[PDB]
């Protein structure tokens, strides 16, 4: 109920002064307003890192001073136990001790006996601390254009990126979450450079009248410390026109892009208060764009601060989802980074649950309810793939309190009490399970009741906010798991604690061997199918659910399930669907019109198997039907789910030409976009199975024929084929799958080759108003998917043929586009990115030799992120297959040394996804000194951020996980 944390707190004041751009430092004094809890509260602890304190003071009494950093290495630097398990446990205990959620110490000012007798008298104090941030080496950012003479004035900006509890790394506070306070914030700014934080513009004129300005932001609304952040330098645009108080801040010469970008935001606020039945529970909303991100999402109080990649300025169609997509997260988590708030790290999951689910609800009623369902399927893709890579993603209420473990999910690392142990794979899947468990709460409970719950939540919170600080009666904004659950059951008490102990408290994905049987195959037994499952490693047994079956033209048959899963079950039987030449359509689903006796229709009154098409249980369903039923489901079904899963099932085995026919038929209607993209890849696989069975044509050329008439298109489709965004994605996708079409003589896509080169010829002028950009990019990736591994039979790597022949043509085109985007550049060098992937795939077939120095020259500093990020993916696979020790050393040195966080994040992420030096396959000899430097980088050089050494934990997970590395 209450915090086990003493010394309640009310108010705090910051005052940044003397912010430097040359030695690049910040000075400031903080004051704190504390009601202590018990006497002898002497060694008062706050916490920070990378903070040289200048002085401490309580009421003109500089009291004592304790300053440790056990967030640094092991107490002995050569603790030879250099494996995972000891380090994980030791680091877990270490940073748990760093947390003040116990009697601890990082900043323990000791109360003097004078002030202790005052505590005996009055437990009300003020705390004044002078301190100075240095060059911030893991807490802040000073984005500086490398000019330093004049453009250091106009061209730089300054802010704070960081994770959840990175307020420590900025200015000293508590365990930064779950301490309800209010703030007055004093900001020493340039008169031009505008600084934006939480709260309100409460006191600012041309301030202090000397040379600069100084801002007062007061947040009266009672929040916690991990919401506070200050972006200094941009330009103001109120992008108000519909809702009058919506505030935006961007770097100069980026401004009118916001004029396209920012809008649709009003519609989102309209949506959110259609949900919540409040107002936007604040004064205003503030948004900062920045060339960097520790995290792309980042969302704080009244303010979302995130990257300048999401502008999508009016012509750049493919960020039509993405921009407002991410804007949705930067509102929803906003509210639950506002008000609802975790009582512990082990209490959060409801927060990200309801936040992500709410913007899922947004994605329903904004665009693509079928793309909504598609998004859910990708969620299951991420979750199933990760918890079959790894162990579970569990949502504890449970501690290992008393030095206990209780962690089967310690397949790598700690989770229970701590954010800063986890992987981004883990933290991402945490959010993904959060979405889907809220969908299960839909599955047991009305959406209207969800509105009821959330309105009660925010009513109690906004009531408990904005007052005189009701003393001892204020922490109702900690709305964590237990009382939330209680409020759910107060709205409707159902058996949702089984829902918890299934999904919240048994992190297991469930496959399904629901084995198809066929009764009423003129069978005495009638319409029966068996239930089956067992598959450990990561299994889970979920029993009582139901089953969704479509008849021929009839009932959605739904059938119960049980535990003790060696089961056989029936179907609520269809009629005697006989004389079905006469029973043409006895009402399939509404007025749908279909006739085929093409299936095994002597005695097949069935059409389709399903378990829970609304995707209730975390599933990976394995079964078998007649292939007719799969293909006919692809003739039509009312689920994108069903359509792409029959897409996968028919990507496995078959090749009739009727399959090809029904595929193409599916591609030419109004059905769905991405359905057709995976249908293209169906044609790719099945026409690759057409080597001896080349029965159909050179495929899909006819699809560009019969679907595309510019001016009836006399044999070639060229021009202006946009504004119909079905066709946009479809033309963007199809030639890639055409470049896959290969039959084994030399895999010979020669017609397709020359055809795609012709596609690259016939590109449009400014008649297309839509910046003919990504179309180029995926035509280039089709050329990258012209993978020709087997030209160099003996030695042909080395300028020998000026290697030949069509490879050279592909080289001509990619050389052209690289120099065009060096000259034109169109939008993020996205073309250049696809080019770099293409050039690496050319090295992976030995045509341009395996040399990294190009990619090395695109991993450099002064390029874009995305260029640099793709070069790093490339050189990671280079060091994977080729055995370059030296560039690996370079890579790790740059993991140490570069200013950008997000490259370090993605280096370590896809380094771990795509490893060299793979465990117990050690030919390139990590044991020599590489384990040593890696152990160092786990210990040293990585106190900048948590997640960098979390990635290093992932490195030692993959590379030599649960053991000595076979050194000594």
């Amino acid at each position: 109920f209450e915090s086990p944390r003493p010394y309640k707190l009310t108010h705090q004041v910051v005052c940044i002064n003397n912010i430097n751009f040359q030695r690049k430092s910040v000075v400031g004094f903080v004051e704190l307003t504390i009601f202590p809890t018990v006497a002898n509260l002497n060694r008062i602890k706050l916490n920070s890192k990378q903070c040289r304190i200048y002085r401490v003071r309580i009421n003109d009494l500089e009291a004592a001073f304790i300053y440790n950093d056990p967030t640094l290495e092991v107490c002995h630097s050569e603790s030879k136990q250099r494996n995972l398990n000891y380090f994980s446990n030791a680091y877990a205990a270490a940073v748990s001790a760093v947390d003040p959620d116990a009697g601890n110490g990082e900043l323990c000012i000791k109360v003097p006996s004078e002030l202790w007798k005052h505590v005996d008298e009055l437990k009300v104090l003020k705390i004044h601390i002078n301190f100075s941030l240095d060059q911030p080496k893991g807490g802040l950012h000073f984005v500086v254009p490398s000019v330093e003479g004049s453009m250091a004035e106009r061209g730089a900006h300054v802010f704070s990126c960081g994770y959840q509890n990175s307020t420590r790394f900025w200015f000293p506070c508590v365990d930064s979450y779950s301490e309800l306070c209010t703030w007055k914030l004093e900001f020493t700014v340039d008169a031009a450079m505008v600084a934006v934080s939480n709260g309100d513009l409460v006191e600012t004129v041309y301030t202090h009248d000397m040379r600069k300005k100084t801002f007062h932001y007061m947040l009266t609304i009672p929040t916690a410390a991990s919401n506070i952040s200050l972006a200094i330098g941009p330009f103001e645009i109120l992008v108000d026109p519909y809702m009058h108080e919506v505030t935006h801040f961007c770097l100069p010469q980026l401004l009118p892009l916001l004029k396209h970008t920012t809008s649709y935001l009003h519609e989102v606020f309209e949506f959110y208060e259609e949900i919540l039945t409040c107002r936007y529970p604040y004064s205003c909303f503030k948004t900062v764009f920045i060339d960097e991100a520790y995290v792309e999402v980042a969302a704080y109080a009244s303010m979302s601060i995130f990257s300048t990649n999401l502008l999508h300025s009016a012509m750049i169609i493919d960020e039509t989802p993405l921009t407002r997509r991410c804007l949705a997260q930067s509102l929803a988590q906003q509210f639950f980074g506002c008000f609802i708030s975790r009582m512990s790290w082990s209490d959060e999951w409801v927060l990200k649950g309801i936040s992500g689910y709410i913007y899922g609800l947004w994605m329903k009623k904004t665009f693509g309810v079928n793309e909504y369902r598609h998004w859910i399927k990708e969620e299951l893709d991420k979750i199933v793939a990760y918890e079959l890579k790894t162990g579970g993603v569990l949502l504890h209420p449970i501690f290992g309190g008393g030095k206990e473990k209780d962690n089967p999910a310690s397949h790598l690392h700690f989770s229970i009490k701590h954010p800063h142990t986890l992987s981004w794979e883990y933290y991402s899947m945490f959010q993904c399970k959060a979405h889907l468990v809220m969908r299960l709460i839909e599955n047991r409970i009305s959406m209207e009741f969800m509105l009821q719950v959330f309105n009660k939540l925010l009513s109690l919170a906004s009531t408990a906010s904005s007052q005189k600080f009701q003393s001892h009666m204020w922490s109702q904004m900690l709305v964590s798991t237990s009382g939330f659950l209680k409020s759910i059951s107060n709205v409707s008490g159902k058996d949702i604690q089984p829902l918890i102990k299934q999904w919240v408290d048994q992190s297991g994905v469930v496959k399904f061997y629901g084995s198809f049987a066929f009764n009423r195959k003129r069978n005495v037994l009638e319409l029966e199918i068996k239930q089956d499952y067992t598959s450990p490693g990561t299994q889970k047994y979920v029993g009582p659910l139901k089953v969704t079956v479509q008849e021929l033209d009839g009932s959605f048959n739904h059938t119960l399930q049980i535990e003790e899963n060696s089961l056989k079950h029936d179907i609520p039987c269809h009629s005697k669907s006989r004389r079905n030449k006469k029973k043409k359509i006895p009402l399939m689903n509404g007025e749908e019109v279909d006739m085929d006796l093409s299936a095994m229709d002597a005695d097949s009154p069935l059409l389709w198997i399903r378990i829970d098409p609304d995707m209730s249980v975390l599933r990976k369903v394995e079964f078998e039907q007649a292939d007719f039923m799969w293909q006919y489901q692809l003739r039509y079904e009312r689920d994108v789910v069903a359509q792409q899963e029959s897409i996968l099932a028919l990507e496995k085995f078959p090749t009739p030409a009727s399959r090809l026919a029904l595929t193409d038929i599916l591609e030419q209607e109004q059905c769905f976009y991405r359905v057709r993209m995976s249908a293209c890849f169906c044609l790719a696989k099945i026409a690759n199975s057409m080597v001896s069975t080349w029965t159909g044509p050179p495929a899909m050329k006819s699809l560009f024929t019969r679907m595309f008439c510019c001016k009836s298109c006399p044999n070639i489709v060229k021009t202006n084929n946009f504004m119909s965004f079905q066709s946009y994605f479809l033309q963007k996708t199809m030639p890639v799958a055409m470049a896959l079409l290969r039959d084994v003589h030399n895999l010979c896509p020669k017609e397709v080759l020359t055809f795609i080169l012709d596609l690259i010829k016939y590109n449009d002028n400014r008649k297309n108003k839509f910046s003919d950009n990504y179309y180029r990019a995926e035509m280039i990736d089709a050329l990258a998917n012209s993978v020709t591994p087997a030209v160099s039979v003996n030695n042909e790597v080395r300028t020998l043929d000026n290697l030949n022949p069509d490879v050279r043509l592909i080289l001509e085109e990619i050389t052209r586009f690289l120099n065009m985007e060096k000259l034109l550049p169109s939008y993020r060098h996205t073309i250049t990115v696809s080019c770099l992937r293409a050039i690496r795939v050319l090295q992976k077939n030995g045509h341009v030799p395996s040399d990294p120095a190009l990619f090395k020259s695109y991993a450099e500093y002064g390029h874009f992120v995305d260029i640099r990020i793709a070069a790093l993916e490339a050189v990671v696979d280079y060091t994977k297959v080729d055995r370059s020790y030296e560039e690996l050393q370079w890579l790790l040195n740059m993991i140490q040394n570069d200013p950008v966080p997000y490259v370090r994040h993605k280096i370590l992420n896809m380094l771990t996804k795509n490893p060299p030096f793979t465990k117990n396959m050690e030919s390139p000899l990590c044991n020599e000194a590489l384990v040593d430097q890696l152990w160092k980088l786990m210990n040293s050089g990585t106190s900048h951020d948590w997640r960098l050494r979390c990635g290093a934990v992932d490195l030692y997970f993959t590379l030599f996980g649960l053991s000595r590395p076979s050194c000594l």
């Binding site: 254009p145 980026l254 300025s313 050279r808 390029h863």
Partner: peptide, 22 residues
């Protein structure tokens, strides 16, 4: 220098004002 002389990298100071400019 004959067949494929790709331009090397510039890298310059401010990438975003360039790559995000219609």
């Amino acid at each position: 220098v004959s067949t494929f002389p790709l331009i090397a990298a510039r890298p310059f100071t401010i990438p975003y004002l360039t790559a995000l400019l219609p």
